[PDB]
């Protein structure tokens, strides 16, 4: 009824995950509406350029763009075993006056391929502000936490202190590259236009009695009507399936970024340092994003393979595949960005869990700070280094062998050797003094790189 | 209605491609009904093993296996953000008596993982007879055409003659390897059974007051009820997702086979030697098979990646992915097998086209046999080789430079140097003499390898 | 030099990673020596079946199996742009008496494909005992640690306790499935044998003057000489490239398993519960490397899938360059991973006092039901007790997250006279060995029923 | 040997396929010379910026950039189990005065990552002119063959005529999209620069005693010394591995293009319409087969960096290292080989016009029937009636072809039928192949003038 009977398989991307907006863009109502819209634009342009098409035929066509008899369309397709021709017949039935001029000069891909290009670009236009919003919410988080010291991890082992906001900027930088990629692909998408069966426009040239200029005009007119700046000069029957690679490749790369970000979030949730928005709390949304982002990456192999084995001016082995992977890649991407937005709005941070971890690990990373202090006081770097080695091993043994807390500072405190440095210990181990340039980097990044990127999307934040 | 509104995305695998039977196996009806079947079996087993579950509670559960309020379950899941708990609640709603004991001792995966294993095996069982049927129909074609000479192709260039039937056996053999793969994975599939939250059955042990024999018997009892010969001993929360790799990998390899087979048919269609069953005729069914087969191959990277990053006793980042890739792999495989059967039932061959192509190419492959005939006629191999070489270059130029028919045999016939073999030319150029052991290979293959494999189906 | 001068690219798989044994299996010496071995076996069988081949011709070839002039071969291949014909000519140069009968009746794939099948089987035979050894070492660890309680993880969040040994069985099981896979593919690998240019044996049938029996005998005999139980009946020019899918698919699956296992170890290394074999701060670098290589193993499966899908008719040569890369690389990658995993599995470091601490911080939240059950057994209510134990768990969780302190939930219960009926039981109720379920029982049954039978064939090489 | 002894595995990419120039770029000599060049630049800039480095330390480091003791470095790496530190120690041993300031403040990635970025960019600079050269050769072919009619193929079945040159433009267009992608990735490549252990420059900030300006100057000074216009602001330990996805994705899409082009060439070769250049009746399209084989590996390799980036934890994990040693080099050596081979193919492509012409003659009559019907309607005949008469003749001709294995005799059937007497005198004209190719010829001209030549202009050299 809505997403269908439960007695048959229903894609989870439709019934469970994707927004109504993205679902509609990949719906048959939208597909077949656009087929008629393209047929109308064709008749309109053809009428202007002199072909015998009456205003009645245009008005009739224009008044039935939504008037789609799916039952009739289905029966015709069972009969003809051809989907475009099924719809040509069905459109001509409710438009009896224009029936004879519908699809005039065109091959099936005039509606099929141009609709897919309109769908791709409209789908890209849906993703962009959703991605932009996720980036803005994280940028707010990053700026807010820019100076909050946190344990750094390499090999997922204790490393030089970063900040929560600086770490957030690694996430933001990858998503920003995705925003630029998606925009580039949307902006550079070209219209197939009117090209004919094998790309030569032979049909249209005959209809215009050899007038090459009128053929070029028609192609320009339908392109403009479709809202595209530019059409291919060169096609076979179809737009080059290299286009489908370009689109799904940028979505795949977005998948990898989201999977990385959400893996980091899941690890922070184990560490109790950060948690998804409101005893056992599971980072289920981040896990979902990983799950769906993995499918995005997997799907890139479909268009790669498809384009690689397209023979000459077209083989029809692209069709069933594209029905699946194009829609599912955008429905998957839509779901991910909707969820990441929801995650990024109220990430819970626990400063005192973060501080406890730093206090347990920083003493082992601060030994050169201690030597420097003792040497400046007039001690020996060689004598000091030995003393710290032993006390550090003692502390390490407590942590590993006994499961105790790190007591290195306490050992240094009660050892008389470090007499000239006892009053400095609190300053020397101040975690903010160990975070390098993290806060200055966050500011400069957001200002120079992030905010300029977001400016176009302020309207819808 | 049945597939839903055209105002929303609908999977073409559902609305366009897969059979009703496969669509039902991956339907929410079948799934949640099976969830309830597993709860019934559990309560039955747990009752036999002494837990406080009454007969009338079990009657209540059995009477309601199909009575599923999908609207309520969706209301609960919106509220609980937990799918299995929503169905526990909803089953407990229409079963007020048994409500207290549904899911007793189980974790979510008890219904979720076991249902997937039941579904995977049922799906495999739907595929197997269809694949056997394709093989059977192709075997019929291979037998009928076992001796029909046809131009061999290597580098897709003219090569040593094969037969139509022998070439078909290349196709059959790959599909036989798939049939064996699918049957193995089906037969080796193990039930998760009752394992508790992290795989230790700590819940059931406590319910049975430390009695291990009862905990093992429960696992055995529910496994048997589900009709599985064997259950896992070792699990985390889930069955190992390596299982999903094993299943989709064999599906991926089936895809590769069908893509190659259908690519060959498409090329033969261009050559006008073969056509799909009944001016332009397009091998559309073969093209669609290729299209879908490619998706089957692509899908293997999903379970590979999933398994690689499951942490400890399980992470929930397998869940959304599996909802998509498992169903799709099987619905795609189903479609391909349904279409491949259609293709295999009336393949059209054009012997006269096949013959004409052999006549254009065989003379170039027949020159060593002409030379052999001259040598034994009291002649020189080196002289003949040079004479035959110039005429073969002459004929090759007519073909490529003049777009003409190959006239090499006519050139040989009129050149008096070949007087010692002129009377043998009809014999020397008989295409059936050039196919080597192709028909005998077909006979032995079908007899020894194919027919024994089909005998159970 | 051994791996060439540093002024050109050199594969890390050869210069850095794989064992010498696996490198040699994928060497040109081994390849081209096997070409010659195959030529000798063909001449042997042909002579037996009556073709005009002499004992001295066979003696000559046998004497020169290893006497490969690589420079001459390269020179000839530059002239002929054909690798097999280059080696036919080179072999005939050093075997002048045999030159005329080398490769008699055969197409190039007689040496190319059959050598690849010999290599694949030999390569699997190198991997098998290495995996068996990894499984056995982990099985020893699993038995040793079968009762050692450890915090369970689902969502990587605290869950019902498992044991260190039981968790190891999750890893072992996957590798046992791989071991079975590799053995199956190895055992079921069929020989191409002698098949001719398009698979019809037309050349051989003519040589034997139409005697079908003799062609069938030839194929049997060379298959037997190469040590294979079974040859294909049906081929085009090549063995079906579906074979390459079957082999690299099992390697890909092994890759996923090792990636999972080594990710778990790296996570245990962060938690300080387990470390790699022998400093305070240590990196799981070997596990990281195994993950890095395992990923390449999974990636490589798409090569033979694609290759097989677009082979036209009796074969196209677009498989050749690809197979030179992916078959060797997959095995060199797999070999390295198993060499490293063996090393990781020997002396895995465990820290029971870190494990215990973590358990004590998390168990009380998972033990509330037991503390309630004990009150109801004493005489208290379950509705009343569940509420009072709720609020204490709330404050303890807040101490952990808001204060950043230790879990004081058991102290809150201890210092509260409502839980007076059960105060003396608290240690018994919180005994972590009482929460591990059937973990240790499962380890024993698994090892005895599933693991040890698999390992028994490999006992002499352990 | 020079590729090593035949007793061990040797990559066919080095031993067999790639050019010596691309082999050199991914060689250890080039890698470790660049490590030392980077150490020289770090010291140079550090000296200028006031750190205690002498001129004879710099004179020493500069004079030993090529004097690499690989044996010593290998010994050191076995001992340290650390490749970078082995080379710090080895470089310090031949530069004993400078030993104590080599790598000052830096982490291993300073040399590791920056060298990889230098190599990636130099690798892309080798490919670019090669791809431009292929496009240029193909454009000459397209121009020469712009108007030559050839049978169109859709479903790989006879379709509306195109031209040899127009079909070549489908190939050219995909390669032009690749040239733009590679150029884009190359230009947008950012330097990692000096970032420290976890990306915070804490080491350098200390060395400059809190002077942030000097840390920023150092990052700019080395970035500029390396010939890069821009450095990252935000890194962890490493440059984001999304960079590797971006680079191998464009190579993967290039593989798809080449696989399609070479598949078409292989099909044309079967049809005897086109052949690879002469280096002879049975000829195999072996170069094109090889290109398809390698292209496939290029497409396969994209899943490596996708997976790598998706599971990088925090400021980095070392599970990327081994994978990248394989896939980055292999992708570029594979790409290099394809382009070398494709240029070779494109240089003397052979066309057989009489074969092409014969195929057209066999197939065109069946596509000419609508045009014959139109000429009869113009002469006074009924469309419906004429369609029926011509349909029987057409079905008779198709049966001669398929059932008798004969030549298409449809035109002869029409010529001797008195029914078609009104158009008999027009048949020669109605069946002219050039008249069926539509705008194919003008499309080649416009495409080459507007979209190809401007892209090639910069590469003139
Ligand atoms: O415009 C034409 O019809 C000309 C034809 N090109 C085609 N162009 C577009 N669609 C075509 C084409 N051919 C078939 N079909 C129809 O597409 C449908 C494919 O079904 P599916 O494989 O399920 O996606 C399915 O309905 C097919 O009938 C050509 O010969 O070049
Ligand atoms: O036995 C034959 O030669 C018959 C031929 N089949 C072939 N079988 C095996 N190898 C062949 C074949 N053809 C070429 N080549 C040679 O393979 C080599 C391919 O080189 P690469 O692409 O670099 O791997 C390269 O050396 C090629 O020359 C056929 O026409 O069916
Ligand atoms: N450990 C678990 N086992 C089974 N299901 C779970 C678990 N944790 C959460 N879930 C639920 O499983 C579903 C996952 O949804 P999805 O990510 O869309 O597959 C959600 O309803 C979760 O609440
Ligand atoms: N954080 C790091 N950055 C760079 N290199 C490292 C780091 N940690 C270890 N290494 C070294 O990098 C090399 C990784 O080797 P492989 O995994 O074979 O590429 C080894 O020599 C490691 O010791
Ligand atoms: O909800 C469950 O069934 C399991 C949850 C978990 O393991 O965290
Ligand atoms: O050895 C290094 O350069 C870095 C090591 C680390 O980050 O752990
Ligand atoms: Cl059109
Ligand atoms: Cl359970
Ligand atoms: Cl069709
Ligand atoms: Cl052979
Ligand atoms: Cl390390
Ligand atoms: Cl640095
Ligand atoms: Cl060749």
């Amino acid at each position: 009824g809505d997403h269908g009977s439960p007695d048959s398989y229903r894609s989870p991307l439709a019934s469970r995950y994707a927004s109504p907006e993205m679902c509609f863009v990949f719906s048959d109502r939208y597909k077949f509406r656009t087929w008629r819209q393209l047929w109308l634009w064709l008749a309109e342009a053809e009428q202007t350029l002199g072909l015998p098409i009456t205003d009645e035929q245009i008005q009739e066509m224009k008044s039935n763009l939504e008037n789609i008899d799916f039952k009739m369309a289905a029966e015709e397709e069972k009969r003809l075993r051809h989907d475009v021709m099924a719809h040509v017949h069905t459109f001509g039935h409710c438009c009896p006056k224009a029936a004879g001029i519908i699809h005039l000069g065109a091959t099936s891909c005039y509606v099929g391929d141009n609709t897919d290009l309109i769908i791709l670009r409209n789908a890209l236009d849906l993703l962009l502000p959703k991605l932009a919003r996720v980036i803005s919410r994280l940028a707010d988080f990053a700026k807010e936490r820019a100076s909050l010291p946190t344990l750094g991890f390499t090999h997922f082992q204790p490393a030089q202190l970063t900040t929560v906001g600086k770490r957030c900027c690694l996430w933001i930088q990858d998503l920003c590259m995705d925003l630029q990629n998606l925009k580039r692909v949307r902006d550079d998408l070209r219209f197939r236009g009117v090209k004919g069966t094998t790309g030569t426009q032979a049909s249209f040239l005959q209809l215009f009695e050899g007038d090459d200029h009128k053929v070029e005009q028609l192609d320009k007119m339908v392109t403009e009507k479709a809202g595209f700046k530019r059409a291919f000069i060169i096609t076979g029957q179809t737009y080059t399936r290299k286009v489908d690679i370009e689109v799904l490749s940028v979505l795949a790369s977005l998948g990898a970024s989201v999977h990385k970000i959400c893996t980091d979030i899941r690890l922070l949730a184990n560490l109790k340092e950060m948690e998804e928005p409101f005893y056992k709390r599971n980072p289920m949304r981040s896990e979902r994003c990983c799950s769906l982002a993995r499918h995005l990456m997997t799907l890139v192999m479909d268009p790669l393979q498809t384009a690689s084995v397209q023979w000459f001016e077209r083989t029809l082995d692209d069709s069933a595949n594209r029905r699946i992977c194009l829609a599912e890649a955008f429905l998957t991407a839509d779901t991910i960005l909707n969820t990441l937005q929801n995650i990024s709005e109220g990430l819970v941070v626990y400063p005192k869990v973060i501080e406890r971890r730093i206090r347990q690990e920083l003493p082992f990373m601060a030994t050169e700070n201690i030597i420097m202090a003792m040497v400046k006081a007039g001690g020996s770097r060689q004598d000091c280094h030995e003393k710290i080695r032993v006390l550090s091993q003692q502390a390490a043994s407590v942590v590993k062998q006994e499961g105790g807390d790190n007591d290195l500072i306490e050992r240094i405190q009660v050892d008389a050797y470090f007499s000239p440095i006892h009053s400095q210990l609190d300053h020397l181990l101040d975690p903010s003094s160990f975070t390098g340039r993290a806060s200055q980097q966050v500011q400069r990044f957001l200002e120079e790189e992030v905010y300029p990127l977001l400016k176009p999307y302020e309207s819808v934040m």
Side-chain angles (χ1 to χ4, degrees), chain A:
Chain A
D2 179 45
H3 290 119
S5 183
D7 297 67
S8 195
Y9 168 75
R10 303 176 282 192
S11 181
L13 291 168
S15 57
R16 196 179 172 80
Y17 293 126
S19 70
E21 290 75 22
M22 188 65 76
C23 287
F24 181 67
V25 164
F26 286 98
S27 76
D28 281 336
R29 169 153 288 285
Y30 184 96
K31 177 181 182 171
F32 300 130
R33 170 174 89 182
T34 304
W35 283 17
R36 295 179 173 206
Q37 182 65 258
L38 283 159
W39 279 318
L40 177 60
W41 289 330
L42 185 64
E44 284 174 352
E46 284 181 340
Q47 192 192 37
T48 304
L49 301 173
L51 297 199
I53 296 164
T54 68
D55 294 350
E56 255 195 351
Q57 291 168 314
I58 291 181
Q59 288 189 46
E60 185 191 63
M61 289 179 74
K62 190 171 188 180
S63 298
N64 291 127
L65 300 172
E66 322 295 324
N67 192 19
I68 306 170
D69 187 342
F70 295 96
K71 173 168 184 164
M72 176 172 291
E75 288 177 355
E76 291 292 306
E77 189 175 344
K78 253 188 162 180
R79 195 169 74 76
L80 300 168
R81 310 225 155 279
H82 198 295
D83 62 350
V84 178
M85 292 306 92
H87 276 270
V88 169
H89 283 41
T90 296
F91 196 29
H93 187 265
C94 63
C95 299
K97 307 291 267 171
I101 59 138
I102 292 165
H103 204 224
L104 180 65
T107 191
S108 294
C109 285
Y110 171 67
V111 294
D113 262 24
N114 284 311
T115 295
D116 288 341
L117 287 162
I118 289 165
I119 286 172
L120 288 175
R121 196 178 62 179
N122 287 352
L124 282 167
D125 286 352
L126 287 180
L127 293 182
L128 285 158
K130 293 185 165 182
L131 180 53
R133 278 198 290 275
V134 174
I135 293 163
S136 172
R137 300 293 190 287
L138 294 171
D140 294 359
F141 182 80
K143 188 195 179 197
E144 193 214 342
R145 307 296 195 173
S147 301
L148 179 57
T150 200
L151 195 62
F153 289 126
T154 64
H155 301 263
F156 198 25
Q157 289 296 328
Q160 304 222 44
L161 305 192
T162 186
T163 64
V164 175
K166 173 65 202 295
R167 173 173 287 158
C168 190
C169 296
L170 305 209
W171 301 338
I172 293 164
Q173 178 162 64
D174 277 21
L175 294 169
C176 282
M177 288 166 64
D178 289 313
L179 189 63
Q180 286 171 303
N181 277 357
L182 274 57
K183 178 71 150 62
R184 181 184 46 76
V185 166
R186 179 264 184 243
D187 287 352
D188 289 354
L189 206 60
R190 282 130 73 165
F191 204 61
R192 173 192 179 275
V194 286
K195 295 293 192 285
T197 305
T198 56
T200 70
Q201 300 164 320
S203 48
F204 299 104
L205 192 68
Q206 192 177 46
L207 284 165
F208 291 124
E209 310 200 305
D211 195 334
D212 287 281
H213 180 233
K214 283 190 170 185
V215 180
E216 293 278 44
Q217 284 179 307
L218 179 63
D219 204 32
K220 265 147 192 126
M221 290 168 81
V222 309
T223 300
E224 278 216 73
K225 290 171 184 285
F228 277 74
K229 294 198 187 213
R230 191 173 159 161
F232 285 100
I233 298 179
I234 299 298
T235 70
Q237 183 165 99
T238 67
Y239 71 78
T240 176
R241 301 322 196 204
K242 187 167 188 75
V243 168
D244 293 0
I245 295 167
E246 302 304 286
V247 177
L248 265 59
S249 293
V250 307
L251 293 179
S253 180
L254 173 71
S257 295
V258 174
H259 196 281
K260 188 265 186 277
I261 296 162
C262 288
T263 293
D264 284 355
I265 290 175
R266 293 161 57 197
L267 290 179
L268 291 168
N270 170 272
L271 298 172
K272 307 184 197 289
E273 298 198 327
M274 181 189 272
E275 220 156 40
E276 287 177 8
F278 299 118
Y279 166 83
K280 189 180 193 178
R281 294 196 64 204
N282 305 318
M284 182 65 248
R285 284 169 277 240
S286 290
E287 290 176 299
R288 185 173 295 109
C289 286
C290 289
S291 198
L292 293 165
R294 183 176 311 123
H295 195 59
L296 274 187
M297 292 185 289
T298 292
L299 287 174
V300 79
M301 296 308 298
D302 262 338
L304 281 165
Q305 285 177 95
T306 289
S308 78
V309 298
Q310 273 293 302
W311 303 339
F312 297 112
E313 285 72 40
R314 203 274 161 87
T315 44
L316 256 293
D317 62 316
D318 62 335
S319 182
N321 193 280
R322 287 167 71 259
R323 287 181 196 264
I324 300 174
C325 69
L326 296 185
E328 290 194 351
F330 279 94
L331 291 165
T332 300
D334 188 71
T335 306
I336 287 169
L337 299 180
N338 296 332
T339 307
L340 209 37
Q341 167 85 150
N342 188 243
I343 290 166
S344 75
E345 291 171 8
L347 272 168
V348 177
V349 168
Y350 301 99
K352 289 277 166 166
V353 172
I354 293 173
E355 283 176 45
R356 172 146 188 176
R357 185 161 283 101
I358 284 179
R359 286 196 281 95
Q360 294 295 309
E361 295 293 352
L362 187 64
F364 293 115
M365 299 181 292
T367 62
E368 181 50 40
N369 264 57
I370 298 298
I371 292 172
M372 275 182 274
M374 284 288 296
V375 170
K376 168 164 157 48
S380 161
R381 174 187 277 279
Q382 187 54 42
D383 296 359
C384 193
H385 208 129
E386 254 96 56
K387 205 79 181 180
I388 294 172
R389 282 171 210 256
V390 52
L391 296 179
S392 172
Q393 194 190 273
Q394 289 170 3
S397 199
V398 172
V399 177
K400 290 205 181 174
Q401 308 301 306
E402 308 182 12
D405 288 348
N406 189 1
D407 60 9
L408 180 51
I409 306 313
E410 183 164 7
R411 290 173 187 283
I412 290 170
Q413 281 184 6
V414 294
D415 198 317
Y417 173 91
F418 303 98
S419 285
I421 255 59
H422 284 144
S423 64
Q424 298 178 44
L425 272 168
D426 295 308
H427 184 100
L428 282 172
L429 272 165
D430 183 353
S432 66
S433 74
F434 285 88
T435 60
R437 298 182 73 267
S439 47
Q440 298 207 161
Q441 293 171 328
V442 174
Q443 182 183 347
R444 195 205 160 189
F445 170 67
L446 290 176
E447 286 175 358
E448 293 192 3
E449 306 191 349
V450 179
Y451 298 152
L453 265 51
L454 295 170
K455 211 174 188 288
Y457 302 90
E458 263 203 332
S459 173
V460 299
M461 292 281 151

